């Protein structure tokens, strides 16, 4: 019977005291096939009609039913279907995709729809010819006249080849003859069956059609008929209940690049939030390693204990235990022109003590019990003064000593524990025995699994401060890190929230046009992962190339990185980059069109 | 004779091949008052040659001159102010502020021109009347209709009574009764002495118009005039604190309509600060808790290993940059008042050896923790009261240097003098200072000092270590957020230059342009800045009282470095393209 049944239909816009009855109690029915124009005085509810006709409003109160179907009972995506296939809309103020070419605007109704792309351009380039574009198929719209992006809006109404043609004042900015064809074309579409819904104010234009009506404050006043309307029978249906995300790869590369500067500050703005927190971690333990080592080299830590040889020998045979000494000391007199220690092979390397200057006591020189003695940096300088003591002899007690080295410290003289106790002092019992505990077993846990060993004291200030200070510099690192992850993280968010919402229009022509709501959601997460995994990408190697150059040139400590930053920086960085990119284009697909439009 | 004189007027577009030719060799001269309809195809270079004529693009070649003045040889404020007392522009697309109200989008074209805000709305409201809108007036343009926008557009171009009004398809989306009206206004202004050029396509409406124009391809086909044109007289010509305070009222209200934009910049800015802050503080926190754990394993001194008085060490102790001082020489080591100060031996239990035991060469010993658990005395048979302990780092005995000298040894001689070097002078300048302070007394030799110093070496090692840490991560953090501002920043006002190339159009100045966006950042940054620097604060508030290890100590350098910094970036950025688009022909701005 009829196409479009209205009954009943108002419409409000505003919140009282400021709010408005716009459409008041209007019922229209409008027969199938019929070339109906609209007429009324500026902002008398025509287009506010129109909308709620197309399924891009939703009138306040009434019943509104396409097809007999009403209308608001209708899911989501049965909408979208109807705004593909049955409508075809003409808006008033063209509402083109700026970025797109003319032939691109043309057929975007169509890749929702699901055609091939070779046949969408070759089409919307006839579309285009008929309008008497096709000299500008290629031009966007802030490269053509109003009457062009016009005409563009058209050929885009025409591409589905809607069954309804709902066009909203579509010549207003086209001359007389640019105008009579594009009626020429109207008229054409008619004549095959086509269903014309048509608002204007030129009456030439009007003349093209079947029915008159005229709108005025809310409500309908004319109704007039040339001629009966031939009966039609209705279409079968359009409604559907892989390929749709190669379109969508497509356009959402296309849309990045459009957008250079949102997309290049984007992608920015995640190197960073990767980069920063990585650069401070990374900083963070290399100054770590050198502090701790800075207080490793203050000193050693030491446990000093029927002490013979071979127990001395056994406790370096230890992975706990990376030095051992044996010790006996002597009070004599020395002769050139005192304290004679009996250390061992290892003794320096227990105590910490660095080679200034020759060598230090070789096993040669324990083995033979030989008369080689190693001097303090204040014993060498008060015997020699300023001059070189390699070589030359010392004499305790009436016992030559030939110097072989210098050492640093903490009269004092290191010899062989062998030499003091055959050339010196005789016996066999020695001192005491002192070992260098490793520096990554625990403290205590060595001072009783060493009176277990050798059942079979000890100096750790240093272990202490390295520990103490081992967790400072961790509350250090850990909340400097949390900072600048949360920091870069805000940043994604900033500028995410901005450039996506400020396409909120977009996805209003969108969704006018035919597209689904997952159509959008799909180019909008690709448009967010492609742009931040490769603004991951940039990031964790930009942070490499800013590593290298600091260790080039920074003498003082090593920017060792920590593959779990690069992990925790990059997952964070996306998984909200993405999050905030689709969080908005959501919530804009499901705003009525023209909610959306106006924004 | 002649307000517009355009000859040899020669425009293109593109980059050939995207090059096209689009007006061609136009001369055209209209005459002063006249009434012109101008009329052609689609496309053909009507609305090209308006702009050109409006003082809104400028032609490739050939001359064009209002008031005999030619246009491209006038300052950028003398079009400014063509702009907004000459012309009168209706857009064909009708290029409103969606932000402003009816009345508003009506009355801005007058803040330019310099009228109190009292009589803009009123006039506003009226020119609205005139109209038909003044049921609307409060109304923002996507509350309204395409001809009521239309309308609220042709409105403001009557605003300034300027006495061209190049109107491009006023009457498009109108009916014929409002056209007509629309029509009827037109009609009156040309009576009242104005000069109409008119683009459109409807005839009902030219026929109202003397003269004719028809373009195709971009030359002039026709030129039609009914009737001669009424002799005319030349017009006059038409070429900061008020100023300013009217461009921070729409700063405030651009700002409070961009909620989200604002919130998120000065939300930029606000992290800017407290992210350098907090690092800054909570490093120099953790190096005074690091430098105190070295200080804490040992002090500084300088052995001074005859010829020993102890009126030497007496005015060695009389320094600033020695704190402590003390006389040297089983074992029992007679050492002096401060001893235990010099090396950092603390008390056990007991007490130090007093004043009144070196004086009196008193017979007591302070035991090492070491030598006192071992044993627990007679030294040399002679008795010796026990008196405390100390902290340990053969058997040690601490006894006077007096008690050793008298009661043990004998000899006025002494060992050596230590002395506890300060912890803010500099080594290597207290071992050639030494030396030149006590050579004064010539006591030499010995002076062959020793200076045990690596404690004093390890915090400069590792103060050093610091500074460059805390100095990359707090160059870092502010780059970050010196890039988040302007990330934030570049877009916000990029995204807005279309508002600009309409307030340029419609008569804006240059400079009123950077005045109200300078406004919009200062405002917007020294809001944020508040907000940085007293939320640092709460942070540290929340971080010295949960944690007890160190303290995060804020830095009065950094909070002053970051502040500035982070505004003088985001002002930076959101002068920088304001003025840039503002300096763009209004069209190409518009095209945005
Ligand atoms: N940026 C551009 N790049 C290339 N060509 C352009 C550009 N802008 C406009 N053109 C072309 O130059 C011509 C100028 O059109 P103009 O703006 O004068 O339209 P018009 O004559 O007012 O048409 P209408 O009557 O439809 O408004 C058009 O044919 C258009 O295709
Ligand atoms: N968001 C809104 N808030 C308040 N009022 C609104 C809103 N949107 C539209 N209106 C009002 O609803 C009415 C309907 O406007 P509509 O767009 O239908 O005009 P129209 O019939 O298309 O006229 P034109 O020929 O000018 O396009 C107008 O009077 C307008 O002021
Ligand atoms: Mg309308
Ligand atoms: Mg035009």
């Not at 127990?311 to 006996?328: C, E, G, H, M």
């Amino acid at each position: 019977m009829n196409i479009i049944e209205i009954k009943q239909l108002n419409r409000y816009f505003g919140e009282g005291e400021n709010r408005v009855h716009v459409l008041k109690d209007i019922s229209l029915s409008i027969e199938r096939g019929d070339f109906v124009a609209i007429m009324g005085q500026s902002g008398s509810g025509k287009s506010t009609l129109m909308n709620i006709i197309g399924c891009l409003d939703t009138a306040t109160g009434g019943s509104s039913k396409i097809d007999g179907k009403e209308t608001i009972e209708l899911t989501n995506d049965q909408l979208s279907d109807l705004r593909s296939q049955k409508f075809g809309f003409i808006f008033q103020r063209y509402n083109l995709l700026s970025s797109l070419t003319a032939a691109e605007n043309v057929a975007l109704p169509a890749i929702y729809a699901g055609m091939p792309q070779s046949q969408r351009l070759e089409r919307a380039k006839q579309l285009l010819e008929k309008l008497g574009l096709g000299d500008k198929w290629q031009n966007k719209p802030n490269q053509l006249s109003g009457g062009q992006q016009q005409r563009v809006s058209i050929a885009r109404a025409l591409m589905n080849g809607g069954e309804i043609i709902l066009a909203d004042q579509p010549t207003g900015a086209l001359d007389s003859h640019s105008g009579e064809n594009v009626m020429e074309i109207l008229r054409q579409l008619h004549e095959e069956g086509h269903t014309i819904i048509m608002v204007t104010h030129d009456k030439h234009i009007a003349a093209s059609a079947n029915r008159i009506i005229e709108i005025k404050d809310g409500e309908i006043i004319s109704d007039t008929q040339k001629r009966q309307v031939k009966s039609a029978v209705k279409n079968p249906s359009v409604f559907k209940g892989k390929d749709q995300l190669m379109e969508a790869f497509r356009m959402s590369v296309s849309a990045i690049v459009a957008h250079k500067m949102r997309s290049l500050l984007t992608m920015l703005g995640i190197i960073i939030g990767i980069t920063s927190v990585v650069s401070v971690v990374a900083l963070g333990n290399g100054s770590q390693q050198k502090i701790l080592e800075n207080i490793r080299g203050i000193g050693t830590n030491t446990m000093t204990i029927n002490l013979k040889i071979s127990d001395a020998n056994t406790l370096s045979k230890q992975s706990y235990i990376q030095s051992v000494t044996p010790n006996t000391s002597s009070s004599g007199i020395l002769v050139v022109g005192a304290n004679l220690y009996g250390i061992g092979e290892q003794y320096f390397d227990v105590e910490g003590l660095k080679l200034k200057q020759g060598r230090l006591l070789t096993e040669d020189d324990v083995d033979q019990s030989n008369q080689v003695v190693v001097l303090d940096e204040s014993a060498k300088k008060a015997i020699f003064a300023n001059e070189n003591p390699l070589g030359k002899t010392v004499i305790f007690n009436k016992r030559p000593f030939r110097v072989i080295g210098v050492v640093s410290d903490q009269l004092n003289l290191y010899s062989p524990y062998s030499t003091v106790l055959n050339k010196i002092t005789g016996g066999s019992r020695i001192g005491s025995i002192t070992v260098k505990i490793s520096d990554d077993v625990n403290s205590t846990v060595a001072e009783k699994s060493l009176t277990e060993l050798l059942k079979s004291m000890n100096s750790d200030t240093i272990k202490q401060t390295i520990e103490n200070t081992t967790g400072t510099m961790k509350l250090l690192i850990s909340s400097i890190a949390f900072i600048s992850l949360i920091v870069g993280g805000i940043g994604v968010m900033n500028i995410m929230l901005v450039s996506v919402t400020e396409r909120t229009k977009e996805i209003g022509v969108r969704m006018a046009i035919g597209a689904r709501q997952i159509n959008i959601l799909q180019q909008f997460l690709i448009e967010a992962v492609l742009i931040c995994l490769i603004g991951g990408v940039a990031g964790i190697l930009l942070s490499v190339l800013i590593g290298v150059l600091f260790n080039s040139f920074i003498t003082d400590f090593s920017m060792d990185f920590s593959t779990a930053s690069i992990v925790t920086a990059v997952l964070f960085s996306t998984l909200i980059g993405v999050l905030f990119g689709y969080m908005p284009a959501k919530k804009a697909a499901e705003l009525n069109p023209i909610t959306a439009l106006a924004q």
